[PDB]
Each structure stands twice: as structure tokens, then as C-alpha cells.
Amino acid sequence: KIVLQPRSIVVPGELLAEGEFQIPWSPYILKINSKYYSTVVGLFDVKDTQFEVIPLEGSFYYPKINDIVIGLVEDVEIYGWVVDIKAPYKAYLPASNLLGRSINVGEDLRRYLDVGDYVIARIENFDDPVLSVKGKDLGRVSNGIVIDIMPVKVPRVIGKNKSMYETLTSKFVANNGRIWAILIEAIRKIENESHIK
């Protein structure tokens, strides 16, 4: 078991380590017969005996269950709402979920959520992502700014022990690569220097 690199900037096909590590499957690391290569432009990190690649690149968010996500309503279907969560997959919000009851005869139009509305919502199902707005604070975004970032950069915007979130607060980050709130410039600066200091 050997690691080839320190905290290094890494690239697709780049050999990270040789030997049998018991690494959980990652989309950022490809294992071939006891060699491990990065699959992405990223930052190689060693965590305890294991290691990872922190992707520095990626416009898309990958859906995960129970992620608090903030999405943009795209279409209003007969039984629900089609929602953009910046993923390869369009999320769907059942009307029955939002309402907490049956969709009544000729009921609604776009009064709860319209096209162009932002929604804060959790991912109730994904194996297309089905959303839920059950929890508190979830629902249509009435006010403020919704700033867009690389979803890949979200952990850096929050920071270990909220340390980055706190230094922006005194001067809501979703998993989605979207933050409901100049705050914009400081976030773009963390996007463009996540790999530094």
C-alpha cells in the first residue's frame, strides 16, 4: 500500500496510489487492479489511511437523498412541479406533498409555486429525484438573492466547522450549488481559490 502524491492538484488518469486500500467507491477515483487514478481535475487528499479526490471542476450537482436543495420551477404538470436542481436529472415535486392532501377538482393554477419560482426542498427519493417540502424553511423563496456556484465548491463555501459560512455571515448554502442570501464577489473568490489558503 503506497500513495504517490502529497496534497496535490490532480487530473484525469493520474496515478494516486498503488496497493489494496479499502476505499469506498468514489466517482472521482478509478481503481484498476490495485492502482488508483483520479477521474477528474481535482485536489488529492489523504484522509487517515484512505484518500480521496476533491473535484475542482463540475457544473452539475449529483442528487443525494435528504439533501436540502434549492431549485427553480421549470414546468407545472397536472399532478406536480418539474424543478431544476442543477443536476443531470430534473427533480419533481408532487403537489400532494406540498398540499398535504389530494389535488382537488380543477384546483390550483400556479398559486403555491409558479414557473420561475425558486423552491427550497429536500430530496425525498433518488436511486429521477423526487422532492419534498415537508420540513420547516422549505418552500417557495419569497425574497432575497439566490446565487449560483459550482456544486463541487459547496463544502468550501460552508467550510469545516462552518468556519467559512461564519466569515461570510457576519460580513443559506444548499448542496445544490445554490445559496439563498457584496456577498456575490466573496463567493466567486472562494470558487476561484478553493484550492488555496
Binding site: 466517482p27 487514478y37 477528474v40 481535475v41 436529472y89
Partner: protein, 233 residues
């Protein structure tokens, strides 16, 4: 027919047979494209834009276990010595297939079921090797888009000019030479991704040329890696 290897053992642009044209690589070239790149090999210049992964509206054409790669190789009308008709030619159709299939090996398409990943390539200047320059620009554009890949793809055409095995052909060499053999691989994985020969070579020459292409490929591969790393390091 021009003399391709000159009396001083050198080529029409002054190069040695084992010598590459100058390479220039830019990333993050477009605002909208999820990933993008310009790749220059000598006077051959391609730009690539990647969009995806994204759901594939023609849903019956989506794959249940896999992203569909949708690849376009295209040449601008003013990329060539004489004007190329902008309507896609058979060459562009073939090269789009060959380039897609090159990328099929590298892109971790199983990660994104029933999505499409769009790889759009434009040749802005064509002076030989543009299918490869397009392919490498595509590779770099995918890496730039954060789309997981086995490896980067590096490629060169080798060939034969006045009986001499040469690395990285000119348009003069491609036009007037005896053989033109574009090869692309995932170099760290030892895997060939694109392999064509147009023209004529003895089997021994074929194997000599194959060997030389790997040497050029490893250089290009190092520059790809260095180019991707340049904005972070």
C-alpha cells in the same frame, strides 16, 4: 509533388522526423459551455465545448445504464485552403463517429444513466491532424467540465514522407505523403482509443511509426496534464 524530406534530412517546416509541432492549449475558453478548450498543434486549431451530463429529451434514445455521448466534429468553412461547404461532409460524419468512439473508452458514462453528454468540436484552422486536435480538445473540455474520465486522450498522426517515418504531419505531408496514421490513446492506461491509417506502409514501417507515435503521444499527454493543472498550480 513537393520534396517532403529535404537534403539536410529535415522537413518542409524545418522539423526533424521525430519532432512535434508547437502545442498551445487553453481551457475555460467559453462562458456557457460546462467545459471548454482550444487545442493548437502547429497551425491546426480546434475549439471544444462540453454540455452535460443532462437529461436526454429524445427519451427513447437515452440509455438506461449509461450516458449517451453526442459528439460533433465540424470544420468551419474558412479553416481550409479552399472554402469547405458548411453542411457536414462524409469526412466530418466519419470523424465524428471515430472521435465519439475514442471518447466512449475514456468517459465514465455509467455514472450518468439516461443522460446525454454533448461534445461539440469546431476546427478553426485545418493544417493536418484536426480529428486528433479535436479529440484532445474534447478530452480537455470534458476534464474542464468535471466529467469523470478514465484518462485524458493524447494523439498524433505519424506517417511516411519520401520513405521516412515522421511524427505529427503537416498538411503538405498529409496531402503528398505515402502514409498518414492518426493514433490516440489513454496513455496511462496503455489503451488505444483512435487508430486509423490512410495511405500505405509496410508492416515494419507500420510498427516503426506506431512506436514513434507513442513517444509523441507521451509528450502531448504531459502538456495536457500541465495545461489542466496550470490554473490551480
Amino acid at each position: 509533388r513537393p520534396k517532403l524530406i529535404l537534403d539536410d534530412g529535415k522537413r518542409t517546416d524545418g522539423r526533424k522526423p521525430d519532432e512535434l509541432r508547437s502545442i498551445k492549449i487553453e481551457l475555460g475558453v467559453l462562458k456557457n459551455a460546462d467545459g471548454s478548450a482550444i487545442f493548437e498543434m502547429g497551425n491546426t486549431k480546434a475549439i471544444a465545448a462540453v454540455y452535460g451530463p443532462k437529461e436526454m429529451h429524445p427519451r427513447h434514445l437515452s440509455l438506461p445504464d449509461r450516458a449517451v455521448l453526442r459528439v460533433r466534429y465540424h470544420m468551419t468553412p474558412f479553416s481550409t485552403d479552399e472554402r469547405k461547404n458548411p453542411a457536414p461532409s462524409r469526412r466530418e460524419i466519419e470523424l465524428s463517429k471515430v472521435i465519439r468512439e475514442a471518447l466512449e473508452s475514456a468517459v465514465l458514462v455509467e455514472l450518468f444513466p439516461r443522460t446525454a453528454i454533448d461534445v461539440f468540436t469546431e476546427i478553426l484552422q485545418a493544417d493536418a491532424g484536426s480529428r486528433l486536435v479535436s479529440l484532445m480538445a474534447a478530452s480537455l473540455a470534458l476534464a474542464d467540465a468535471g466529467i469523470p474520465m478514465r484518462d485524458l486522450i493524447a494523439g498524433v498522426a505519424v506517417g511516411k514522407a519520401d520513405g521516412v517515418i515522421i511524427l505529427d504531419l503537416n498538411e503538405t505531408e498529409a496531402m503528398w505523403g505515402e502514409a498518414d496514421m492518426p493514433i490516440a490513446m489513454m496513455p496511462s492506461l496503455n489503451q488505444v482509443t483512435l487508430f486509423q491509417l490512410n495511405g500505405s506502409m509496410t508492416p515494419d514501417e507500420f510498427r516503426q511509426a506506431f512506436d514513434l507515435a507513442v513517444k509523441g503521444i507521451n509528450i502531448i499527454y504531459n502538456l495536457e496534464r500541465e495545461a489542466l493543472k496550470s490554473k490551480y498550480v
